[PDB]
């Protein structure tokens, strides 16, 4: 179903803040922000989909995402809080996309 102004602004906001949180989590851990994003995304979507990403300098298999998810869970409370933020931002991203999937149809019918 379609998004109420509140639901839209909320999912949007959570996305922006999870992007922020991946930046902060890179600041903290010194790992690559893209690798971070792909790990958070992996665990959000599930193991149903994990595959090698072309920009990533590392092959993204369940072994290394478990390793990096573990080294992420080994954080202080005020840092691991950013892991919870990024997870929420990824889920907001998927829900906002799937919400606005009908705008695409109404726009491509004229093409």
């Amino acid at each position: 179903p379609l998004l109420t102004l509140e639901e839209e602004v909320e999912l949007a906001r959570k996305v922006e803040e999870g992007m922020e949180a991946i930046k902060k989590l890179s600041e903290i851990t010194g790992l690559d922000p893209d690798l971070i994003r792909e790990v958070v995304r992996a665990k959000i979507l599930g193991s149903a989909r994990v595959r090698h990403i072309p920009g990533l300098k590392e092959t993204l298999d369940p072994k290394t995402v478990e390793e990096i998810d573990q080294k992420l869970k080994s954080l202080p409370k005020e840092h691991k809080r950013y892991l919870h933020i990024a997870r929420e931002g990824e889920a907001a991203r998927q829900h906002l996309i799937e919400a606005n999937l009908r705008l695409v149809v109404s726009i491509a019918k004229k093409y």
């Binding site: 102004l5 509140e6 602004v9 906001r13």
Partner: protein, 52 residues
């Protein structure tokens, strides 16, 4: 409002009650759609804490 403690003094044909009261006063805050609450239900705050 509740009367925590009650001190009394006798004087002439009366008493004067020095009541140590404790009570809660409400204030409303209207939220707009562009806004978000940062506080759970029934959660206590102090002077300067963020509500919305």
């Amino acid at each position: 409002v509740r009367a925590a403690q009650v001190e009394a003094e006798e004087e002439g044909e009366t008493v004067y009650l020095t009541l140590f009261l404790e009570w809660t006063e409400p204030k409303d805050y209207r939220v707009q759609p562009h806004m978000n609450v940062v506080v759970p239900e029934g959660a206590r705050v102090e002077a300067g804490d963020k509500i919305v």
